[PDB]
C-alpha cells in the first residue's frame, strides 16, 4: 500500500475519474468517457494496494461489460501488477487476454537528467493551440492512450517542443498532476530528425517542466511507443513497476498495445 506501484495506479486512478463516469464494482472499476474513442473508456483496479477476492472478480466484470456494452463499447483493461498482484491472471481467466506487460518507468526530481543541446537545438514550453497541434502532429502516428487541447495550467498538464534552427522536430507532454504524479506520454520525433537524441531531449525537458513549474515530485512513463529505443536510464528514470494491458475478445483487441 505505501509502495510505488500502488502510488502510480491510484494517482492514474484518480486522473481518469476527473472526466469518465465510474462503474465501481469490487475490485474493478470501469471509466466511460464522454466520447465513443475507444481507448478513452477503460476497467482499472478499484483499490491499488489492498487484497481482492477474486471470487468477485466474474460478477465484477460482467457488471463492468454490460456498462460499456450499453455504449457499444469494447472493454480493455490496465493494471500495475504490483498494486493487485494476480488480478491481471484472474481477469484472464474470465475471458480477458493480457496483450502486453510494459514496463513503468519513474523518476524523482533530484535523479532527473537533463542532457547537453546540440547545436541549434532548443526547446520551449507549448503555451497556444497552434503549438499543440504542432505537438501532436509531431507524435500523432505514435501508439498514445494516455496536454489536448491546449490550457495554461502546468499542474493540469502540458506539453514541450524541441526545435532545430527555431523549427518543431519533437515533442512530448506530461500529464495532470495527482498525488504529485505526473506521467509523461506523447514522446515524438519528425522521421527526418531521428535517432539524434531528440526525443530523449523532448522527454527530460518535459519531466523538468512537470517538476518545476507543474508541482509533481514524482513522473513515470512507459517505453518504446514511439518505435523508439531510445534509452530512458540516461535522464534518470529506472524500471520501477509491471503495467499490465487487457482486451476483452474481438471488438479492438487487436489495437491494443
Known amino acids: 500500500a505505501m509502495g510505488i506501484a500502488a502510488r502510480i495506479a491510484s494517482a492514474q486512478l484518480q486522473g481518469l475519474v476527473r472526466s469518465r463516469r465510474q462503474v465501481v464494482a469490487g475490485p474493478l472499476v470501469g471509466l466511460l468517457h464522454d466520447e465513443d474513442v475507444w481507448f478513452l473508456s477503460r476497467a482499472v483496479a478499484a483499490e491499488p494496494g ?3 477476492d477474486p471470487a468477485e472478480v466474474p460478477w465484477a466484470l460482467e457488471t463492468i461489460r454490460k456498462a460499456f456494452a450499453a455504449e457499444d463499447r ?3 483493461a490496465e493494471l500495475v501488477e504490483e498494486a493487485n498482484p494476480g488480478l491481471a491472471y484472474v481477469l484472464v481467466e474470465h475471458g480477458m487476454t493480457i496483450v ?3 514496463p513503468l518507468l519513474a523518476v524523482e526530481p533530484g535523479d532527473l537528467l537533463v542532457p ?6 532548443t526547446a520551449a514550453v507549448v503555451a497556444s493551440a497552434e503549438e499543440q497541434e504542432a505537438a501532436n502532429a509531431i507524435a500523432g502516428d505514435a ?3 494516455d496536454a489536448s487541447p491546449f490550457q495554461p495550467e502546468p499542474a493540469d498538464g502540458g506539453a514541450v517542443l524541441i526545435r532545430m534552427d527555431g523549427v518543431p522536430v519533437a515533442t512530448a507532454a506530461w500529464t495532470a498532476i495527482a498525488d504529485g504524479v505526473t506521467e509523461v506520454a506523447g514522446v515524438g520525433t519528425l522521421h527526418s530528425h531521428r535517432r539524434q537524441g531528440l526525443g530523449a531531449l523532448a522527454t527530460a525537458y518535459a519531466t523538468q517542466q512537470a517538476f518545476e513549474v507543474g508541482g509533481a515530485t514524482l513522473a513515470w512513463l512507459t517505453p518504446g511507443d514511439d518505435g523508439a529505443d531510445r534509452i530512458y536510464r540516461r535522464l534518470g528514470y529506472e524500471p520501477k513497476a509491471t503495467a499490465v494491458h487487457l482486451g476483452d475478445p474481438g471488438g479492438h483487441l487487436a489495437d491494443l498495445r
Open 143 to 145: 501508439y498514445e492512450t
Open 50 to 52: 489492498v487484497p481482492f
Open 100 to 102: 502486453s506487460r510494459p
Open 116 to 121: 547537453e543541446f546540440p547545436a541549434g537545438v
Open 74 to 76: 469494447w472493454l480493455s
